[PDB]
Design a protein around this nucleic acid. Structure first.
Length: 102
RNA sequence: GGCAGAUUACAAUUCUAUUUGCC
């Protein structure tokens, strides 16, 4: 969250999306606040859904990255505590937990 | 860093890489 200046943080973490959600739907729900950054290697928007390895069901968790950091900040200020696909969600500032194994 | 084209491989439990052209 506010634990960093986020001057280099353009990603938000999301929880509660749903067990049947899609990258395109999440992107359509976040793009209305600001431009989601697009992958130039894959052409899909920067969203990463997560899955349970013990059940194979979706965690309801995902990251979304923005083309600018103030858009990510507005996305937290706005989407945090709203609903998506008919499910309550929770947005906040992300980091790179990937860096523990990358 | 961004824009266009091309290539290959792998992964997570909170932001992929390589490569050609241009600034």
């Amino acid at each position: 969250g506010s634990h960093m200046d986020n001057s280099d943080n353009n990603t938000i973490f999301v929880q509660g999306l749903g067990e049947n959600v899609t990258i395109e739907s999440v992107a359509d729900y976040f793009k209305q606040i600001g431009i989601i950054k697009t992958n130039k290697k894959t052409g899909q928007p920067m969203i990463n859904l997560y899955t349970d390895r013990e059940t194979g069901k979706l965690k309801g968790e995902a990251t979304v990255s923005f083309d600018d950091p103030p858009s990510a900040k507005a996305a937290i200020d706005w989407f945090d505590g709203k609903e998506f696909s008919g499910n309550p969600i929770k947005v906040s500032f992300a980091t790179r937990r990937a860096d523990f194994n990358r």
